[PDB]
Symmetry: C3
Subunit: 521 residues, 3 copies
């Protein structure tokens, strides 16, 4: 009763390769969950040659048929079709019952049939997420301050332990092949690959073949189901409260309420997604990634993208302020002047002379630590060629207009623009609140309540009042901006929003007051 | 596959007005999501004259047929039937392809066919939610302290920005029509209304025609689906942790666990809701709003209400204590003596002389700040005519008994009463904990750790220790009472309950101790 | 439309006892929800004699047929079959329309047909949960510190009030029969039992007949549905953030994401659960309790257990450190040496002389407060017979291997072992962080920032810095271990994980610094 007879289901398949038939004949008994899951995939039932017969909008392969290897064109995508691809390019290739297979199927393997998707992904911030985090000295200092501590002379935590179960679970690990292990399994002797850093399915996973990304985030193996990729649950693996509460905001939004109750009557599987005809409430994919087509006119409302950056005009994740979206996905290459001298001079006139040590310093961040007091403007990062690191105003306006075109499937244009204008005001206000907590932190360093040493960036984030400052942007300003962008309510208020942000400001002020009272006493 | 062919669905409709046929012929291509959503509504398929043929219990119209305008009686409720209603009464009425339409359809428009529902709603605290919050000087001070701050001489945040994305998202904004904007849309020149304060769908939204409320909270447009109104998700737009965690409490409750797994076999659509026959686990609507009828006897278990106040005997939301429910929905009209003189004298004998300044002061709150030390009783608010502002004991007992009658569909009476008695003990205990944190706050003001000035109520809520006091009632006492009332577990404990409340008390005590140590040093 | 006609459904039943027919004829009108719910149970449609005809793997009765009372063998399990069982053994037995019935049906009643399940449960930590919590003087002190306070000389909170709505809601209450109440109900005079401590359905509920447990946790009455028992929602009644966030961790895990979207195509009802054939993503029951059978080979992958302890090798809930699983469910019988003298001497050499008072002291905990500084090892508890209280290394390895066998239905063995190794590193690291906060607490007591008196254990947990210490293990270390074990992401990081733990350490250090600054001033 919903029970799948696995043997009968395998026997009814067609266009299975002789190789895959061998894998299945064994794996159906040793890993029945994998076989059942694979049986649910569109890939188990469609050959590349068949997919290429479909009209462009409906088709979900993108490597031209004549560029797909001949032995793959006329069989469904089975165990051998993925795991046996390009053995010589995979360091985790092992002999396995007469076949040369590798366990970690990578974006470069996917690209054999989905070239366009991999090309798009590889340019994205997601693909570069490990380097964006771990090869940025400032961000890595935050990683370190958050996941390491000392106990009686020794340091605990680090990349392969505390960081692997935390930051790198979402951002991605570096996978290293370190050997093999001989096991006995269901009576059979089997050699398995020994890894460091796998299992891991973070978006910027660094694979053994050097490609970047895990293509099983969003649509997990082995079902590879776009119905899952278009659900909110799948993005909720990584987009949660307190730092990146897109799932929580959406769940409380009316879009979310309606989707939970009505999605049973939506068509979640049509490759060209049709607003109205297929769904009446948007999910993450609807606004961020999906191909959207007008059900009556056939007009493309939005082209599919596997580079999510291309839809965003303003980065709501504060670093430390919200800022125009970076032009490329390699954020670790950004460099900005940290502190304008006119602002530093104004700070020093009020007794905060610490800002002086930041004049002329470059930081690997998209935006400066303070605006210029004369102009009222922040400084924006450049790339190593000296070109602007963030998108132009014209590009922001184009992206904003494309998003409004999506809303316009279900709302009038002024309605959508009104919300985007409100979002601008919240970007402005949260950025000012973040500047305020930043100045309070400079006071903490000036008065000796906290210690700082720029040659050792972990010292920016390693004490309690410094963590309060971090939360002001990383948790509260972010939540307010997210909640405004995606129609939240409590995430902009008591849970993680304005109330928390204003509380945090006062919390910092109280600590400073107690410290001064303890000194001047 | 669940895909709706919109053109075919429109063509199969019957009793559509000539006007609406014109709207549809265009809107099917320009806003396909709205048309699909409207197609799912009961209103797209039933005329007022047809609804009036149904038996009283089954019927979901309430304005007598002969009082519904003749041109509306024999057509389904389409785009023109709502948006073209009473043009002269709506300031947002604009010419629109030959029709006089207004975008914001208001409770007064709904009342054309649903008079009883609007009459009920208009008396409720929900309808008055903007005024209850924003026109109460004390509560508005809390709004202000939570959503505004100063940075280098300037104030940031306010009604149209930080407050609009936060408090007013749930409570409601004031909608102002400020002009129009000429746009080009799908090649067509179209003039749209320019608003301040819309989009917004908070319960007390102040509409352009002066009516109060958004009738798309709970059952959103354009499906207007009671299956959504009876889901927990819809109330979860606004009833969330930390301040009003009814959704979170219910989700963890056994009622919630069972509903999540069994509701696929419930009839969520029958207008007269039948316990047992239609559902075996209650949602928010079941206990708070729904018409409930015994499936075997036909006895009405509970009459439907759109004034949720009528079912509540005790306000669990502390202001600052839990108190008997107000008699009317206009809470901003309540006035109470703040501090009994016998209590103030007792406070002053222990060195807390601040309470003296509250003797004879009236506050716009339902209950006094402290009980009378002689009698042990709180003082309750009056209304401007001097009559009691809160319901009588006899009325509380009636409401309590009506709720128990609902539980009795699925439980014995003593079982339900036992829980309501437990709730009374938690009201008593949380109120005492709130009195304790209030006295700690008086100590903070007395010792100079915090500043207060009653002529400027924002100063009640603008510092860290004051926000700790706020949380003791607004978050923790509330959560404990909610969790007890609706069968929570962790919301009464570690998440937001007893543990947090006792921690908060000690947190305040520690701050006071540190402050005194820094002084007497 | 999903509406059940209750009268017709009752009339279609077969093998109903004459007694139950009498109960139904009345209860269908007075408690329609209970009758509808019971109608959905497998027990309403199967007799014990019929269940015994089924093959062993499929069968869900376990008391041998010839040991089930003859009058129960050939009727379905109706109202009288449960509520009329063994009247003389139940103190809440009352006369009720000619029948001798008791409202609280207990594990001993269930055992009449499900002997094996009750035998298993009765040995488990769950069955003993009230005593584990309330009869442990240290844990009871934590209960007290968290749910009681004083206001002007009087104590508020306690077992029948604050604790009943909090800790005891999950752990269980002690049910006392205290009398009866005469009510009028639907016109009928009816006497009901008056209880203290019921309603309650915590796992260790102490029933009126002296048996331990509530068999309606996990699979609630009256549907008693294993589809509910195997859902995540049901365990989420009690396994939530911040202390025991298994539900929250699972929800964010890929297992959870997939289950939410695919479970509509799973067979959630087959008594012998088949990975792959019946489901492709695991729930709580899958890994913790269920009978799992290979769909192709028929091999038992895991035997069903109602003693969840039997599957666990290491207790992730810190007391105060993570430790090997106790051998028996009676945790209140454990006793450990608290402080090794070599460690105390090392502490005293650094000025923390308080540890001296713990040398030779036994605490009712599974593990010592600090490791021995010489050996680097913790001390483990013994039982009253002096035998080891925690499982052997050999037993841990067996349990670990059994769990890996479950994962192996859907993953290779090295993949699963890799995660369990990562879990070991997190146990090690979180335990060291917990030792660090414990030493900070000893500094707080030494410096006079906090007060302690071992003769009065509530003083361990009654002040703010002490509660910060509690959270370091009870919330943060626990969440990190849970998230690692069950594939969380944000629960190991910003929500309740590494970031919070390192923040807590620094929060304690800041308080100590402020205190010292206020003294040396
Ligand atoms: C051929 C040898 C393939 C390679 C290797 C991979 N994919 Fe594939 N994929 C292939 C076909 C022929 C199809 C059917 C296309 C059609 O138009 O019918 C697909 C489909 C997908 C999908 C869509 C699934 C859905 O539910 O609609 C996805 C998400 C997908 N493929 C992803 C994917 C990944 C992640 C791959 C490597 C791990 C991968 N594909 C490899 C052909 C082939
Ligand atoms: C039995 C004769 C097998 C056939 C033929 C194939 N597979 Fe296999 N595989 C088998 C076992 C018993 C195991 C280990 C199970 C366990 O519990 O550990 C595996 C493992 C794999 C893996 C993972 C290997 C690793 O190093 O991690 C993969 C990716 C895999 N199997 C796929 C696969 C393919 C592609 C096959 C044919 C080309 C194939 N298997 C055949 C048993 C047998
Ligand atoms: C429109 C109805 C949305 C749906 C539903 C969801 N997202 Fe969204 N998102 C939307 C907008 C208009 C914006 C602002 C765009 C910009 O340029 O800033 C966002 C923003 C995000 C972000 C922030 C990215 C950043 O700039 O730092 C994230 C991470 C995000 N959205 C993800 C996301 C998720 C996980 C969603 C469902 C749970 C989701 N979005 C839904 C529009 C909409
Ligand atoms: C009441 C039963 C409605 C009928 C039938 C239709 N609409 Fe509607 N519409 C209604 C309300 C109550 C509101 C907003 C006020 C609120 O409290 O929700 C609206 C709004 C619109 C809008 C503007 C908002 C937006 O999302 O852009 C449009 C463009 C709109 N309605 C169009 C529309 C069409 C095409 C309709 C029939 C298919 C239609 N409305 C019917 C209430 C009602
Ligand atoms: C006639 C011109 C209408 C006005 C304007 C509005 N409503 Fe209506 N509504 C109308 C009819 C004839 C019916 C069908 C009643 C029946 O017994 O069949 C309804 C129904 C509803 C419902 C019930 C929907 C359900 O799923 O059961 C709701 C919740 C509802 N109507 C709300 C509503 C609102 C919010 C309106 C203005 C925005 C509104 N109605 C206007 C007739 C008319
Ligand atoms: C084309 C000739 C139209 C017909 C006839 C009607 N509508 Fe319309 N409408 C149309 C467009 C292109 C737009 C704007 C879309 C966008 O993306 O901005 C609208 C807008 C509305 C609105 C909102 C107006 C506002 O000021 O916010 C409403 C409420 C609306 N339309 C409803 C409506 C009704 C009730 C109509 C007939 C009486 C009707 N529309 C006709 C296109 C056209
Ligand atoms: C009974 C099984 C309930 C269901 C399910 C839900 N609610 Fe409830 N609620 C119930 C009772 C018996 C009470 C106490 C009544 C009183 O007089 O206080 C409540 C209380 C609330 C409140 C508090 C209102 C106040 O007094 O301040 C709210 C806001 C509320 N209930 C809303 C609500 C929501 C959003 C629910 C599901 C998520 C919900 N209730 C379910 C009974 C029951
Ligand atoms: C066991 C398989 C049951 C049978 C069959 C029925 N009931 Fe039951 N009932 C059962 C338990 C285990 C409990 C409470 C103890 C617990 O741990 O859950 C109850 C309780 C009741 C009550 C009182 C509680 C309440 O909600 O009011 C009533 C009034 C009740 N049961 C009635 C009842 C009827 C009408 C039954 C058949 C339709 C019935 N019970 C069957 C266990 C079992
Ligand atoms: C009417 C003549 C009845 C028949 C015969 C039986 N039950 Fe009953 N029961 C009836 C009423 C009106 C009530 C109280 C309802 C209320 O709202 O309070 C009950 C109560 C119970 C209970 C709970 C009793 C308690 O002390 O808490 C149980 C467990 C119960 N009923 C079960 C039951 C059984 C097992 C019966 C036949 C053996 C039976 N009921 C008959 C009405 C009537
Ligand atoms: C595997 C895919 C899991 C599923 C899904 C869930 N649980 Fe789990 N759990 C799993 C493992 C491998 C472990 C560690 C085992 C050990 O010996 O420690 C756990 C641990 C728990 C615990 C901690 C018990 C303790 O040691 O203190 C709890 C309370 C728990 N699991 C419950 C639980 C719940 C409520 C789940 C779904 C929400 C759940 N588990 C899913 C494996 C898996
Ligand atoms: C791509 C479309 C796949 C095909 C078809 C199959 N597998 Fe796969 N497999 C794939 C990926 C992308 C990965 C891991 C890397 C990632 O980013 O997710 C795997 C992994 C495995 C493993 C090892 C991991 C584990 O859970 O143990 C095994 C044992 C495995 N795959 C076996 C397997 C079988 C039996 C397949 C057909 C039934 C099969 N794979 C097909 C991608 C793809
Ligand atoms: Ca520092
Ligand atoms: Ca103040
Ligand atoms: Ca103490």
């Amino acid at each position: 009763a919903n029970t799948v007879n696995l043997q009968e289901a395998v026997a009814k398949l067609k266009n299975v390769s002789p190789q895959t038939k061998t894998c299945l004949s064994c794996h159906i008994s040793v890993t029945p969950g994998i076989v059942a899951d694979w049986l649910k995939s569109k890939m188990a039932h469609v050959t590349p040659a068949e997919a290429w017969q479909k009209p462009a909008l409906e088709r979900e392969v993108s490597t031209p048929l004549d560029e797909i290897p001949a032995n793959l064109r006329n069989v469904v995508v089975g165990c051998y079709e993925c795991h046996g691809l390009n053995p010589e390019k995979h360091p985790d290739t092992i002999d396995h019952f007469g076949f040369k297979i590798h366990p970690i199927v990578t974006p470069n393997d996917c690209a054999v049939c989905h070239r366009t998707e991999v090309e798009q992904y590889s340019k994205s911030s997601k693909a570069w997420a490990y380097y964006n985090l771990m090869h940025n000295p400032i961000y890595r200092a935050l990683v370190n301050a958050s996941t390491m501590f000392t106990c009686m002379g020794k340091t605990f935590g680090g990349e392969r332990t505390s960081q692997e179960t935390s930051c790198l679970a979402c951002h991605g690990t570096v996978v290293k092949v370190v050997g093999t292990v001989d096991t006995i399994s269901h009576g059979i002797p089997v050699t398995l690959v020994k890894y460091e850093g796998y299992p891991n399915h973070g978006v910027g996973r660094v694979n053994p073949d050097g490609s970047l990304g895990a293509c099983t985030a969003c649509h997990p193996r082995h079902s590879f189901d776009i119905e899952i990729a278009r659900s909110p649950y799948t993005c909720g693996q990584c987009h949660l409260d307190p730092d990146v509460p897109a799932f929580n905001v959406w769940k409380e939004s009316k879009h979310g309420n309606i989707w939970f109750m009505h999605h049973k009557k939506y068509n979640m599987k049509a490759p060209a997604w049709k607003p109205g005809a297929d769904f009446t409430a948007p999910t993450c994919a609807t606004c961020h990634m999906s191909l959207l087509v007008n059900p009556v006119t056939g007009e493309v409302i939005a082209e599919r993208t596997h580079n999510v950056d291309t839809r965003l005009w303003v980065r709501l994740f504060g670093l430390i302020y919200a800022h125009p979206m970076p032009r490329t996905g390699q954020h670790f290459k950004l460099s900005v002047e940290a502190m304008p001298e006119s602002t530093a001079e104004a700070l020093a006139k009020q007794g905060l002379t610490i800002a002086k040590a930041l004049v002329g310093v470059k930081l690997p961040m998209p935006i400066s630590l303070a605006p210029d007091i004369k102009t009222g403007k922040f400084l924006y990062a450049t790339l190593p060629d000296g070109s602007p690191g963030l998108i132009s105003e014209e590009e922001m306006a184009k992206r904003r207009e494309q998003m409004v075109k999506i809303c316009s499937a279900c709302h009038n244009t002024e309605y959508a623009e009104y919300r985007m204008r409100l979002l601008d005001t919240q970007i402005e206000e949260t950025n000012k609140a973040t500047l305020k907590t930043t100045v309070l932190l400079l006071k903490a360093w000036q008065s000796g309540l906290a210690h700082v040493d720029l040659a050792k960036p972990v010292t920016l984030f390693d004490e309690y009042i410094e963590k309060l400052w971090v939360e002001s942007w990383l948790f509260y300003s972010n939540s307010i901006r997210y909640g405004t962008a995606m129609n939240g309510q409590d995430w902009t208020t008591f849970k993680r929003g304005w109330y928390q942000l204003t509380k945090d400001i006062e919390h910092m002020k109280t600590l400073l007051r107690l410290w001064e009272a303890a000194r001047a006493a």
